[PDB]
Design an enzyme around this catalytic site. Structure first.
Site, PDB file in Angstrom:
ATOM      1  N   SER B 112       0.733  -0.883   0.279  1.00 31.68           N
ATOM      2  CA  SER B 112      -0.489   0.261  -0.065  1.00 31.68           C
ATOM      3  C   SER B 112       0.666   1.672   0.226  1.00 31.68           C
ATOM      4  N   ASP B 132       9.749  -5.992  -4.100  1.00 34.57           N
ATOM      5  CA  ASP B 132       9.134  -5.957  -3.571  1.00 34.57           C
ATOM      6  C   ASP B 132       9.015  -8.277  -4.166  1.00 34.57           C
ATOM      7  N   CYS B 149      -3.286  -5.967   2.127  1.00 34.15           N
ATOM      8  CA  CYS B 149      -4.464  -5.144   1.967  1.00 34.15           C
ATOM      9  C   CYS B 149      -5.324  -5.512   0.482  1.00 34.15           C
ATOM     10  N   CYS B 154      -7.669  -6.368   3.293  1.00 36.88           N
ATOM     11  CA  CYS B 154      -9.106  -5.811   3.506  1.00 36.88           C
ATOM     12  C   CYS B 154     -10.026  -5.645   2.039  1.00 36.88           C
ATOM     13  N   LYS B 157     -11.403  -9.958   2.260  1.00 41.51           N
ATOM     14  CA  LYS B 157     -11.637 -10.370   3.520  1.00 41.51           C
ATOM     15  C   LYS B 157     -13.482  -9.506   3.130  1.00 41.51           C
ATOM     16  N   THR B 252       8.765  -2.334   4.657  1.00 42.41           N
ATOM     17  CA  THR B 252       8.037  -3.499   3.929  1.00 42.41           C
ATOM     18  C   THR B 252       6.283  -4.599   5.075  1.00 42.41           C
ATOM     19  N   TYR B 291      -9.507  -7.277  15.606  1.00 43.09           N
ATOM     20  CA  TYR B 291     -10.762  -7.555  15.021  1.00 43.09           C
ATOM     21  C   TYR B 291     -10.407  -8.513  13.380  1.00 43.09           C
ATOM     22  N   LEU B 294     -12.220 -11.832  14.800  1.00 48.51           N
ATOM     23  CA  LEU B 294     -13.704 -11.633  14.413  1.00 48.51           C
ATOM     24  C   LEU B 294     -14.411 -11.412  13.001  1.00 48.51           C
ATOM     25  N   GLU B 295     -13.739 -10.887  12.216  1.00 44.86           N
ATOM     26  CA  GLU B 295     -14.541 -10.440  11.308  1.00 44.86           C
ATOM     27  C   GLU B 295     -14.765 -12.173  10.228  1.00 44.86           C
ATOM     28  N   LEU B 436      -3.032   1.827   8.641  1.00 42.55           N
ATOM     29  CA  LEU B 436      -4.588   1.048   7.842  1.00 42.55           C
ATOM     30  C   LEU B 436      -3.902   1.605   6.075  1.00 42.55           C
ATOM     31  N   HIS B 566     -33.315  11.907   5.276  1.00 41.60           N
ATOM     32  CA  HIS B 566     -34.953  10.919   5.711  1.00 41.60           C
ATOM     33  C   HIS B 566     -35.371  10.072   4.491  1.00 41.60           C
ATOM     34  N   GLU B 571     -28.495   9.276   9.803  1.00 45.21           N
ATOM     35  CA  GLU B 571     -29.964  10.600  10.737  1.00 45.21           C
ATOM     36  C   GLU B 571     -29.771   9.915  11.636  1.00 45.21           C
TER      37      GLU B 571
HETATM   38  C1  LIG Z   1     -44.504  10.033  -2.696  1.00 45.47           C
HETATM   39  C2  LIG Z   1     -43.807  11.071  -1.625  1.00 45.47           C
HETATM   40  C3  LIG Z   1     -42.176  10.908  -1.381  1.00 45.47           C
HETATM   41  C4  LIG Z   1     -41.067  11.309   0.075  1.00 45.47           C
HETATM   42  N1  LIG Z   1     -40.181  10.878   0.237  1.00 45.47           N
HETATM   43  C5  LIG Z   1     -39.576  11.818   1.145  1.00 45.47           C
HETATM   44  C6  LIG Z   1     -38.547  10.961   1.343  1.00 45.47           C
HETATM   45  O1  LIG Z   1     -38.008  10.003   1.363  1.00 45.47           O
HETATM   46  N2  LIG Z   1     -37.489  11.953   2.407  1.00 45.47           N
HETATM   47  C7  LIG Z   1     -38.262  12.897   2.300  1.00 45.47           C
HETATM   48  O2  LIG Z   1     -37.413  14.190   3.500  1.00 45.47           O
HETATM   49  N3  LIG Z   1     -39.203  13.399   2.634  1.00 45.47           N
HETATM   50  C8  LIG Z   1     -40.259  13.055   1.368  1.00 45.47           C
HETATM   51  N4  LIG Z   1     -40.832  13.577   1.091  1.00 45.47           N
HETATM   52  C9  LIG Z   1     -42.144  14.879   1.150  1.00 45.47           C
HETATM   53  C10 LIG Z   1     -42.430  14.555   3.142  1.00 45.47           C
HETATM   54  O3  LIG Z   1     -43.762  13.738   2.109  1.00 45.47           O
HETATM   55  C11 LIG Z   1     -43.126  15.832   3.693  1.00 45.47           C
HETATM   56  O4  LIG Z   1     -42.517  17.041   2.950  1.00 45.47           O
HETATM   57  C12 LIG Z   1     -43.721  15.846   5.053  1.00 45.47           C
HETATM   58  O5  LIG Z   1     -44.707  14.613   4.938  1.00 45.47           O
HETATM   59  C13 LIG Z   1     -44.099  17.440   4.880  1.00 45.47           C
HETATM   60  O6  LIG Z   1     -44.877  17.599   6.613  1.00 45.47           O
HETATM   61  P1  LIG Z   1     -46.129  18.210   6.812  1.00 45.47           P
HETATM   62  O7  LIG Z   1     -45.868  17.925   8.264  1.00 45.47           O
HETATM   63  O8  LIG Z   1     -45.745  19.628   6.092  1.00 45.47           O
HETATM   64  O9  LIG Z   1     -47.552  17.958   5.999  1.00 45.47           O
HETATM   65  P2  LIG Z   1     -47.738  16.914   6.164  1.00 45.47           P
HETATM   66  O10 LIG Z   1     -46.909  15.202   6.457  1.00 45.47           O
HETATM   67  O11 LIG Z   1     -48.934  15.916   4.866  1.00 45.47           O
HETATM   68  O12 LIG Z   1     -49.183  16.434   7.200  1.00 45.47           O
HETATM   69  C14 LIG Z   1     -49.907  17.047   7.037  1.00 45.47           C
HETATM   70  C15 LIG Z   1     -51.728  16.615   7.253  1.00 45.47           C
HETATM   71  O13 LIG Z   1     -53.074  17.345   7.903  1.00 45.47           O
HETATM   72  C16 LIG Z   1     -54.005  17.051   7.813  1.00 45.47           C
HETATM   73  N5  LIG Z   1     -54.833  18.361   6.531  1.00 45.47           N
HETATM   74  C17 LIG Z   1     -54.670  18.918   6.333  1.00 45.47           C
HETATM   75  N6  LIG Z   1     -55.693  19.816   5.793  1.00 45.47           N
HETATM   76  C18 LIG Z   1     -56.426  19.357   7.025  1.00 45.47           C
HETATM   77  C19 LIG Z   1     -57.477  19.744   7.831  1.00 45.47           C
HETATM   78  N7  LIG Z   1     -57.794  21.174   7.075  1.00 45.47           N
HETATM   79  N8  LIG Z   1     -57.575  19.634   8.603  1.00 45.47           N
HETATM   80  C20 LIG Z   1     -57.179  18.592   9.758  1.00 45.47           C
HETATM   81  N9  LIG Z   1     -56.115  17.480   9.079  1.00 45.47           N
HETATM   82  C21 LIG Z   1     -55.797  18.353   7.568  1.00 45.47           C
HETATM   83  C22 LIG Z   1     -53.514  15.634   6.032  1.00 45.47           C
HETATM   84  O14 LIG Z   1     -53.908  15.355   6.038  1.00 45.47           O
HETATM   85  C23 LIG Z   1     -52.031  15.376   6.579  1.00 45.47           C
HETATM   86  O15 LIG Z   1     -52.406  14.258   7.198  1.00 45.47           O
HETATM   87  C24 LIG Z   1     -42.187  12.501   0.116  1.00 45.47           C
HETATM   88  C25 LIG Z   1     -43.195  13.359  -0.179  1.00 45.47           C
HETATM   89  C26 LIG Z   1     -43.672  11.874  -1.324  1.00 45.47           C
HETATM   90  C27 LIG Z   1     -45.152  12.884  -1.525  1.00 45.47           C
HETATM   91  C1  LIG Z   2      -6.896  -9.545   7.672  1.00 52.53           C
HETATM   92  C2  LIG Z   2      -6.361  -8.187   7.192  1.00 52.53           C
HETATM   93  C3  LIG Z   2      -7.261  -7.426   7.312  1.00 52.53           C
HETATM   94  C4  LIG Z   2      -7.108  -6.258   7.253  1.00 52.53           C
HETATM   95  N1  LIG Z   2      -8.045  -4.819   6.472  1.00 52.53           N
HETATM   96  C5  LIG Z   2      -7.940  -3.688   6.642  1.00 52.53           C
HETATM   97  C6  LIG Z   2      -9.575  -2.785   6.349  1.00 52.53           C
HETATM   98  O1  LIG Z   2     -10.333  -3.379   5.745  1.00 52.53           O
HETATM   99  N2  LIG Z   2      -8.966  -1.875   6.060  1.00 52.53           N
HETATM  100  C7  LIG Z   2      -7.307  -0.936   6.266  1.00 52.53           C
HETATM  101  O2  LIG Z   2      -7.514   0.287   6.129  1.00 52.53           O
HETATM  102  N3  LIG Z   2      -6.634  -1.867   6.922  1.00 52.53           N
HETATM  103  C8  LIG Z   2      -6.755  -3.090   7.063  1.00 52.53           C
HETATM  104  N4  LIG Z   2      -5.767  -4.281   7.114  1.00 52.53           N
HETATM  105  C9  LIG Z   2      -4.286  -3.618   7.057  1.00 52.53           C
HETATM  106  C10 LIG Z   2      -3.292  -2.908   5.843  1.00 52.53           C
HETATM  107  O3  LIG Z   2      -3.389  -4.622   5.041  1.00 52.53           O
HETATM  108  C11 LIG Z   2      -2.132  -2.285   6.448  1.00 52.53           C
HETATM  109  O4  LIG Z   2      -2.083  -1.452   7.094  1.00 52.53           O
HETATM  110  C12 LIG Z   2      -1.444  -2.604   5.102  1.00 52.53           C
HETATM  111  O5  LIG Z   2      -1.093  -3.539   3.838  1.00 52.53           O
HETATM  112  C13 LIG Z   2       0.067  -1.657   5.497  1.00 52.53           C
HETATM  113  O6  LIG Z   2       0.644  -1.567   4.708  1.00 52.53           O
HETATM  114  P1  LIG Z   2       2.231  -1.571   4.093  1.00 52.53           P
HETATM  115  O7  LIG Z   2       2.644  -0.527   2.589  1.00 52.53           O
HETATM  116  O8  LIG Z   2       2.735  -1.023   5.174  1.00 52.53           O
HETATM  117  O9  LIG Z   2       2.424  -2.795   4.005  1.00 52.53           O
HETATM  118  P2  LIG Z   2       2.424  -4.215   3.257  1.00 52.53           P
HETATM  119  O10 LIG Z   2       1.323  -3.652   2.608  1.00 52.53           O
HETATM  120  O11 LIG Z   2       2.033  -5.159   4.038  1.00 52.53           O
HETATM  121  O12 LIG Z   2       3.941  -4.101   1.947  1.00 52.53           O
HETATM  122  C14 LIG Z   2       4.454  -5.419   2.586  1.00 52.53           C
HETATM  123  C15 LIG Z   2       5.571  -5.836   1.459  1.00 52.53           C
HETATM  124  O13 LIG Z   2       6.645  -5.694   1.424  1.00 52.53           O
HETATM  125  C16 LIG Z   2       6.889  -6.858   1.445  1.00 52.53           C
HETATM  126  N5  LIG Z   2       7.951  -7.119   1.605  1.00 52.53           N
HETATM  127  C17 LIG Z   2       8.515  -7.524   2.950  1.00 52.53           C
HETATM  128  N6  LIG Z   2       9.895  -7.484   3.230  1.00 52.53           N
HETATM  129  C18 LIG Z   2      10.917  -7.502   2.000  1.00 52.53           C
HETATM  130  C19 LIG Z   2      12.406  -7.272   2.038  1.00 52.53           C
HETATM  131  N7  LIG Z   2      13.235  -7.608   2.426  1.00 52.53           N
HETATM  132  N8  LIG Z   2      12.038  -6.741   0.274  1.00 52.53           N
HETATM  133  C20 LIG Z   2      10.789  -6.548  -0.029  1.00 52.53           C
HETATM  134  N9  LIG Z   2      10.286  -7.026  -0.160  1.00 52.53           N
HETATM  135  C21 LIG Z   2       9.753  -7.099   0.408  1.00 52.53           C
HETATM  136  C22 LIG Z   2       5.971  -7.489   2.016  1.00 52.53           C
HETATM  137  O14 LIG Z   2       6.212  -9.110   1.318  1.00 52.53           O
HETATM  138  C23 LIG Z   2       4.757  -6.526   1.261  1.00 52.53           C
HETATM  139  O15 LIG Z   2       4.360  -7.787  -0.519  1.00 52.53           O
HETATM  140  C24 LIG Z   2      -5.840  -5.389   7.682  1.00 52.53           C
HETATM  141  C25 LIG Z   2      -5.226  -6.181   7.529  1.00 52.53           C
HETATM  142  C26 LIG Z   2      -5.425  -7.579   7.524  1.00 52.53           C
HETATM  143  C27 LIG Z   2      -4.212  -8.410   7.669  1.00 52.53           C
HETATM  144  O1  LIG Z   3      -3.318   0.267  14.725  1.00 55.50           O
HETATM  145  C1  LIG Z   3      -4.519   1.184  15.227  1.00 55.50           C
HETATM  146  C2  LIG Z   3      -4.842   1.988  16.060  1.00 55.50           C
HETATM  147  O2  LIG Z   3      -3.197   2.702  15.643  1.00 55.50           O
HETATM  148  C3  LIG Z   3      -3.237   4.704  16.534  1.00 55.50           C
HETATM  149  C4  LIG Z   3      -4.771   4.566  17.269  1.00 55.50           C
HETATM  150  C5  LIG Z   3      -4.622   5.643  17.267  1.00 55.50           C
HETATM  151  C6  LIG Z   3      -3.341   6.263  17.965  1.00 55.50           C
HETATM  152  F1  LIG Z   3      -3.332   7.630  18.451  1.00 55.50           F
HETATM  153  C7  LIG Z   3      -2.364   6.190  17.863  1.00 55.50           C
HETATM  154  C8  LIG Z   3      -2.499   4.324  16.643  1.00 55.50           C
HETATM  155  N1  LIG Z   3      -5.944   0.341  14.064  1.00 55.50           N
HETATM  156  C9  LIG Z   3      -5.658   0.059  12.762  1.00 55.50           C
HETATM  157  C10 LIG Z   3      -7.201  -1.451  13.538  1.00 55.50           C
HETATM  158  C11 LIG Z   3      -7.735   0.539  13.454  1.00 55.50           C
HETATM  159  C12 LIG Z   3      -7.309   1.014  14.144  1.00 55.50           C
END
Ligand SMILES: Cc1cc2nc3c(=O)[nH]c(=O)nc-3n(C[C@H](O)[C@H](O)[C@H](O)COP(=O)(O)OP(=O)(O)OC[C@H]3O[C@@H](n4cnc5c(N)ncnc54)[C@H](O)[C@@H]3O)c2cc1C
Ligand SMILES: Cc1cc2nc3c(=O)[nH]c(=O)nc-3n(C[C@H](O)[C@H](O)[C@H](O)COP(=O)(O)OP(=O)(O)OC[C@H]3O[C@@H](n4cnc5c(N)ncnc54)[C@H](O)[C@@H]3O)c2cc1C
Ligand SMILES: O=C(COc1ccc(F)cc1)N1CCCC1
Lengths: 588, 587
Positions: B112, B132, B149, B154, B157, B252, B291, B294-295, B436, B566, B571
């Site tokens: 890396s 390498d 990695c 990474c 896995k 290394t 980690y 457990l992973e 990392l 939402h 959120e």
């Molecule tokens: C298909 C669709 C998808 C949407 N998806 C998203 C989304 O993913 N994310 C997002 O953030 N927003 C989304 N929205 C928008 C979100 O639904 C609205 O912004 C939100 O519901 C507005 O809330 P409000 O309190 O202004 O009105 P409303 O939730 O419409 O409530 C007003 C209520 O007052 C009632 N009412 C009306 N007149 C009267 C009255 N005279 N007396 C008594 N009660 C009355 C109505 O019947 C209703 O029950 C979506 C909207 C639609 C149509």
């Molecule tokens: C199972 C596992 C899962 C991981 N998952 C994550 C993850 O999800 N996210 C994340 O951020 N990190 C993850 N890591 C950590 C990440 O792999 C390491 O932090 C990263 O690879 C470190 O990079 P590096 O360059 O220090 O060494 P390396 O990537 O290990 O590279 C060093 C290289 O040098 C070679 N080398 C060694 N000695 C010599 C030499 N004398 N001459 C020439 N070449 C040599 C080695 O064989 C190797 O190819 C994971 C590690 C493991 C073991």
């Molecule tokens: O190596 C580490 C943490 O390393 C440090 C974290 C804080 C610090 F002050 C110094 C080192 N991690 C690898 C897997 C997830 C976290």
């Protein structure tokens, strides 16, 4: 400054105690109020910077400068000895319940914003009513408490989206070693609808339970504001009556529009009907090109449907148009047909819906393209998604004096106040605000705290992030590229961009260069990030965290100095380097 | 200040041009170097706010104060007329290739960090070699270019994790209306391994193509630093020779540890062997609780395996222990067995691996619990995940003078410099740094730019976010809750927390109150966010964007004023309100 805040807080609070955390006399009054089940706001002076000045201003109302001091609806009630006198003589309950009005707060509308506002107000002792009524659709569809998002919006549409995403999970599983054969698997629409509707029903019930447990009065009735403090209500039996309230919150939302053409209301449907439809729609035409139109078309196609979208001009008007074109190209490559530059003229009925045998009807759609040429094709279901509008003429008598704009939405101050001093509006009917569920909830909760707990915090409506849940999702926060160039000029805008491929797509043999992201930045302001855009899986999870950084004014250097999490899609934002000006390809 | 930067930059750059964007003489020299295919760094004096001072300092080297000025390995070559004279007389090629050493840069290790550093240095004209070599595992496993990695970390896995996640996707699909029957579907280990290895092979090839296209010399050979500028190499025919370089980067990495018990090396395996194993492990014991442990236990269980994890003391030592316990509780509820407070004493062989019929062997594992009671059970495969270690004795002669710490890692300054002035170290062997892949990549690229392009930017190793890809994923950025309390005291720490349920889990009838998130904050610093923690689906996608906000000093107020998207899992961070001090339930 301090004096005016105290006056406004005392006049508006239902029950409020001015207190100090260290005083045992305050503790004694708190305990009495809790035992009597009297809810109230509390202001702790020993935890405010200028609590010493507030203590002195209180004397203008009570003629004492000491703590505790209890007020009810603008009136000083007493200190420790006096409150305990009222409690000992069984006079306290009468004092805290006297009001000029039936309610401290009436909320018209039981949706995202209104339920949030009503629950929060009741926490500070406001005597609260929430009114909700669902006018049925033209074919008679209705639903329960909770509003548009809960019943016919965000919640059912994302659950149907997940059903569509699982079709690709089934295909992918074969490549990762699982023994299934995707080609012999089919989808059952009514089984999905049954499960979606059972979840919605649990939310309807949960809201009624929540209101009961906060001592909020829920009226399933249509409300109409006939004067600043009077709300006329009509119940399920057409019985009409009048209730009064000190503060009023309008929160009635919007409903779908229909185009003015023959057959549309009679034979088409909208998103209001789709989410509980008892039959599979069959061969379907979606008219419109909003996010509602594209989201619905997308999951219907993923569930095996024959879907066509009729587009009058462009896709996703108001969103970044490079991104919108990428969204639409993905949909067209994965089964959605598009009739471009086309509008409808009439819907004719060929077969009536068969309600007994659970089958759609059959319809003939006639229209024309923009140069003059014609459209004619048969569909089983036609869905209109051509915008949404409020109908405040129903809710609001023009004699009350609440100002509306040309589109019929309410004109409000930056604290949600209308032109009538005790009336407020939140959610989709507040003119100029983003029409989103978490915006409506934040506005309602923050407003309740200012009215009944003396809070000062306003809702911030700028740079609110979005996600469009099309088959490949599109997340965004801030300006589109065209809006940034318009505002600042092309020579002040730098755009960093890259394609990417999810690691999950490698073994599954999906596309190399379809996912895409960009940062739109302002050169003369330290490369400030004006807008962020990503097309890819889980785009809403990707985008959300960056919205905090953009709120705080992130620059490109802030993205550069932050280290990625590997392997993820989101980490690609931390190493962007290709600019559009350079002309170098963004492909992987 | 300025003068010390210029001297350092001129001394170590391979080929560098001092320039201004507006000057046609500089453009003329740029065009000649491009036509001769001479790569070089460029510094545009009119883009730097102290460019005037730099221009005056240049005269100490060249006796002139104008642009362009071209340098090669510390020597002033000429202005416009002089460079063009060398070009038309066919003298320029020999001038730019003159060197005291075979290479401007030798990178030992092609993983890396080392691949990232080598490719970036070559972009500025540094003549570069990347070495390498992959020492085979005890059973003989080896792999191609790209490091831990790419080949045994990474990348494979997370692909096997995805195969496990798709098992629950098959189950959920039934509830969303699809016609399949999950109980009739099975998994084929070898089909999955074949697809994983085909992707890894595309990465091995892609790195060799990238080094060729950047004119980097790739040597598949083992390197040993025998003096500050001399690298002894041994190739695949045991032919030994010596190459010299100006700057050296050690990159290394590490390899897995084995416990010192009978039978461990002979009959067990490590993660190095797992990702290309030709047969399904069968009934498996994982020894360890990192980690990696457990992973691997998690995806093996999701693919249908009978898996036990034997834990010496605690899970995920060094991570937040409330989160670690929730991670482990989820795995135990979904079919992983745990032997707690237990260590192994010996592995005995009952059957040899069946290479013909493609089947594992059979092993007897004996161990004991901390109270002295005995452990004894049979397994087909035993995987050791008990930590990783460098072995710099093999890479580095002690007489070079590069100082190591008590664990054998390289002690570096904040610009990756060792105690030998021309030698640097990056990646997992750099003492004290997070181990990392994206950290190793940033350190290598930023170092190459400082050595060969006059850059000044350092790598920032603080608050680097992580994700553990257990069956329910765990993302984090910043301090654990117990580290925050130890550093600042309990009264100065406030913790906001909540359970949550993904919308996707509702129709699928999954658990109500297993997913969880918290913000660990400092009261006396405006409720600064010290640490963020989330257990749930797509936890790495959730966590990444918040790492930018934490880098910028986000407070609880910044989370509150930002609006949610939402419906999403993420959120829930925007509306947190229940404190642990209040005692109110997070459900
Ligand atoms: C298909 C669709 C998808 C949407 N998806 C998203 C989304 O993913 N994310 C997002 O953030 N927003 C989304 N929205 C928008 C979100 O639904 C609205 O912004 C939100 O519901 C507005 O809330 P409000 O309190 O202004 O009105 P409303 O939730 O419409 O409530 C007003 C209520 O007052 C009632 N009412 C009306 N007149 C009267 C009255 N005279 N007396 C008594 N009660 C009355 C109505 O019947 C209703 O029950 C979506 C909207 C639609 C149509
Ligand atoms: C199972 C596992 C899962 C991981 N998952 C994550 C993850 O999800 N996210 C994340 O951020 N990190 C993850 N890591 C950590 C990440 O792999 C390491 O932090 C990263 O690879 C470190 O990079 P590096 O360059 O220090 O060494 P390396 O990537 O290990 O590279 C060093 C290289 O040098 C070679 N080398 C060694 N000695 C010599 C030499 N004398 N001459 C020439 N070449 C040599 C080695 O064989 C190797 O190819 C994971 C590690 C493991 C073991
Ligand atoms: O190596 C580490 C943490 O390393 C440090 C974290 C804080 C610090 F002050 C110094 C080192 N991690 C690898 C897997 C997830 C976290």
């Amino acid at each position: 400054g301090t004096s005016q805040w105290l006056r406004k807080t005392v006049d508006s609070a239902a029950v409020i105690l001015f207190s100090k955390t260290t005083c045992p006399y305050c503790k004694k009054v708190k305990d009495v109020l809790a035992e009597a089940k009297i809810k109230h706001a509390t202001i702790e002076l020993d935890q405010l910077s200028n609590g010493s000045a507030i203590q002195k201003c209180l004397a203008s109302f009570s003629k004492i400068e000491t703590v505790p001091q209890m007020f009810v609806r603008g009136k000083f009630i007493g200190d420790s000895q006096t409150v305990l006198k009222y409690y000992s003589n069984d006079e306290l309950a009468g004092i805290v319940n006297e009001s000029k009005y039936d309610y401290d707060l009436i909320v018209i509308g039981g949706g995202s914003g209104g339920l949030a506002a009503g629950k929060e107000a009741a926490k500070y002792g406001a005597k609260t009513a929430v009114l909700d009524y669902v006018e049925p659709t033209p074919i008679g569809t209705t639903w329960g408490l909770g509003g548009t998002c809960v019943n016919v919006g965000c919640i059912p549409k994302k659950l149907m989206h997940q059903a569509g995403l699982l079709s690709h999970a089934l295909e992918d599983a074969e490549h990762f070693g699982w023994s299934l054969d995707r080609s012999k698997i089919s989808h059952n629409w009514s089984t999905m609808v049954e499960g979606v509707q059972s979840h919605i029903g649990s939310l309807n019930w949960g809201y009624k339970v929540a209101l009961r447990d906060n001592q909020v009065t829920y009226l399933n009735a249509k409300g109409r504001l006939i004067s600043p403090h009077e709300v006329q209500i009509t119940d399920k039996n057409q019985k009409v009556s009048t209730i009064t309230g000190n503060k009023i919150i309008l929160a009635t939302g919007e409903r779908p529009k229909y185009p003015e053409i023959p057959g549309a209301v009679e034979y088409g449907i909208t998103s209001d009907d789709l989410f509980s439809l008892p039959y599979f729609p069959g061969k379907t035409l979606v008219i419109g090109a909003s996010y509602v139109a594209l989201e619905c078309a997308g999951f219907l196609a993923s569930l095996g449907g024959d879907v066509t979208v009729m587009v009058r001009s462009i896709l996703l008007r108001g969103f970044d148009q490079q991104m919108a074109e990428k969204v639409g190209d993905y949909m067209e490559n994965h089964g959605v047909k598009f009739a471009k530059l086309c509008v409808p003229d009439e819907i004719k009925q060929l077969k009536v819906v068969d309600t007994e045998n659970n089958k759609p009807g059959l319809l003939l759609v006639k229209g024309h393209y923009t140069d003059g040429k014609k459209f004619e094709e048969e569909f089983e279901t036609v869905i209109f998604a051509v915008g949404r509008e409020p109908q405040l003429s129903k809710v609001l008598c023009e004699t009350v004096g609440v100002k509306l704009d040309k589109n019929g939405r309410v004109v409000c101050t930056d604290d949600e106040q209308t032109t009538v001093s005790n009336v407020y509006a939140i959610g989709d009917i507040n003119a100029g605000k983003p029409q989103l569920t978490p915006v409506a909830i934040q506005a309602g909760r923050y407003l309740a705290r200012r009215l009944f707990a003396g809070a000062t915090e306003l809702t911030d409506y700028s740079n609110v992030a979005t996600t469009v849940f099309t088959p490949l999702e599109y997340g965004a926060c801030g300006l589109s590229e065209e809006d940034a160039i318009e505002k600042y000029g092309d020579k002040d805008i730098e755009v960093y961009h890259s394609n990417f491929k999810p690691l999950e797509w490698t073994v599954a043999h999906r596309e190399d260069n379809v996912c895409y992201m960009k940062l739109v930045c302002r050169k003369s302001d330290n490369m400030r990030v004006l807008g962020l855009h990503v097309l890819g899986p889980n785009a809403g999870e990707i985008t959300q965290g960056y919205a905090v950084a953009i709120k705080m004014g992130a620059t490109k250097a802030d993205f550069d100095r932050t280290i990625g999490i590997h392997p993820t899609c989101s980490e690609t934002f931390t190493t962007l380097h290709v600019t559009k000006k350079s002309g170098v390809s963004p492909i992987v």
